[PDB]
Structure 1
Amino acid sequence: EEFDAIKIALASPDMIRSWSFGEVKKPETINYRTFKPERDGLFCARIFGPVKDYECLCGKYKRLKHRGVICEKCGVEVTQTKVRRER
């Protein structure tokens, strides 16, 4: 990480796509009943990451054993929740 300088420049449409991990199509935040992230919504776990550390949304994979294991069913990567601040 230790770096020399910082540069700023106009973002290309394609540059913006690079940082993105998916297109948020829906305004849906979370489910009113299971307060979990909606499908392809603004808090989508499929795009930004898991709500809980090393745990997919539908709950099939748990614990630090499962590492980067994208759950086939719900489509949520088993990594730390920290990722949702960076993705």
Structure 2
Amino acid sequence: FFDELRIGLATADDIRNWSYGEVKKPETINYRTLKPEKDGLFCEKIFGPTRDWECYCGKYKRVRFKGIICERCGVEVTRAKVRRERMGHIELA
């Protein structure tokens, strides 16, 4: 439901809150095997999986598990549509 749209000036804390991870590395995708890197601009750990309800290490690949965060690579099994819904932040020096 929509009543009005407010446009404030975002502070540092809001920017930190909007992000589930920090981009600590400048690579986009691996030149070989064509997958996102562990800390790159396309990392699955930050923006979610690229395959529906799958995992980076392949240990979890079914809707049998959803919302579970993997204990070895950090990617949570969830719909792939989250990759257009989650943001990241860069902490400036």
TM-score, normalized by the shorter chain, greater than 0.5: yes
TM-score normalised by length of structure 2: 0.88
Q: What is aligned with 1:22? A: 21
Q: Which runs of 5+ in 2 are unaligned?
A: 87-93
Q: When you count strand as a share of all residues, which structure comes out higher? A: 2
Q: What is aligned with 1:42? A: 41
4+ long deviations beyond 6 Å:
none
RMSD of aligned residue pairs (Cα, Å): 0.8
SS in 1 for 2:74: coil
TM-score normalised by length of structure 1: 0.94
The separation in 2 between residues aligned to 1:21 and 1:12, in whole angstroms, is 17
Counterpart code for 1:86? E
Q: What is aligned with 1:62? A: 61
Q: Which has the higher contact order (CA 8 A, sep 6+)?
A: 2
Kindly state the Cα deviation for residue 3 of structure 1 after the two structures are TM-superposed. 2.1
Aligned residues: 86
Q: Which runs of 5+ in 1 are unaligned?
A: none
